[PDB]
């Protein structure tokens, strides 16, 4: 009975409530209904990030990027994953890619991406 859009919307409301494993499951139901929508994977990847499930977030970012090569959030969440796994060069490049795509796409996330790039470059440096 529930549409994939419906299920995604439910996931988003769970995400607002900080119920991440639940939210991730709803996105999983969204995928079950339509597995060709990158947002579903991008949305679940963020859930996994919040759950410190980095391997799973990576896999989702990859699935999203196969469906949408222009995905800002897939590149950003990938970068944040790799950062938390001490893969700085790749992380910085992916955050930088996100910055570029968001400019190209007229998306406003305030100072979130530059802030993240600073965090990444600083952490990388703090490890020399």
């Amino acid at each position: 009975s529930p549409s994939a859009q419906e299920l995604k919307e439910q996931g988003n409301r769970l995400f607002v409530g900080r119920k991440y494993p639940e939210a991730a499951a709803c996105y999983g139901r969204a995928i079950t209904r339509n597995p060709l929508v990158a947002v579903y994977y991008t949305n679940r990847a963020l859930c996994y990030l919040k759950m410190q499930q980095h391997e799973q977030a990576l896999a989702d970012c990859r699935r999203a990027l196969e469906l949408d090569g222009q995905s800002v959030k897939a590149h950003f969440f990938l970068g944040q994953c790799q950062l938390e796994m001490e893969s700085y060069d790749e992380a910085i490049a992916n955050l930088q890619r996100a910055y570029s795509l968001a400019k190209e796409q007229r998306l406003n996330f305030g100072d979130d991406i530059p802030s993240a790039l600073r965090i990444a470059k600083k952490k990388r440096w703090n490890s020399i």
Binding site: G11, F15, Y27, L46, R106, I113
Partner: peptide, 10 residues
């Protein structure tokens, strides 16, 4: 264009 937090689902 409204500023929005990036660590949010779409």
């Amino acid at each position: 264009l409204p500023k929005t937090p990036i660590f949010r689902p779409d």
